[PDB]
């Protein structure tokens, strides 16, 4: 990985780029014929929002997702990981990948509400004052439809709307 640093001495600014130790993919993949890191390790349809060890390898130090041309993912799995990272931040599973706070900012104390499987952003969601009749009920989304083909070990399929 590359890093950039700025050192100011004598009212003169100098900018340099220095390489750093870079992690290497583990050897002997199970499926060398796979196209992206997911099928090469037989992980397709086998991860969820809570599998942070898998999700951390595809995000930046501040919680942002990495490009697809870098990771090598397929558009189908890059969208899944991009959505599972959104729900991991919201559930409090990535406390070391927080946004960068500019100098002179102290986040205010806000109601701590525990949550998981949060599809939508809290602030952009309005309350359901009218549930509606039984045949036209306004459901509450739970999870993500992108994870609907995931491996289910039960007879009841993933319910995405409560």
């Amino acid at each position: 990985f590359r890093e950039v640093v700025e050192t100011q001495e004598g009212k003169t600014t100098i900018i340099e780029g220095r390489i750093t130790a870079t992690p290497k993919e583990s050897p002997n993949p199970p499926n060398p014929s796979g196209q992206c890191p997911i099928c090469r390790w037989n992980l397709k349809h086998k991860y969820n929002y809570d599998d942070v060890l898998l999700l951390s390898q595809f995000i930046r130090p501040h919680g942002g997702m990495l490009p697809r041309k870098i990771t090598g993912l397929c558009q189908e799995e890059h969208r899944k990981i991009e959505e599972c990272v959104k729900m991991a931040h919201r559930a409090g599973l990535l406390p070391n990948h927080r946004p960068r706070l500019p100098e002179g900012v102290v986040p205010k104390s806000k109601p701590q509400l525990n949550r998981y499987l949060t599809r939508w952003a809290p602030g952009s969601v309005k309350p359901i004052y009218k549930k509606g009749p039984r045949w036209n009920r306004v459901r509450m989304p739970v999870g993500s439809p992108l994870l609907r083909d995931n491996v289910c070990y039960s007879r009841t399929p993933w319910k995405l709307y409560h």
Binding site: N28, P30, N31, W41, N42, L43, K46, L54
Partner: peptide, 8 residues
């Protein structure tokens, strides 16, 4: 040390 059907 990984078989063809190994899943992390």
């Amino acid at each position: 040390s990984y078989l063809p059907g190994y899943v992390p």
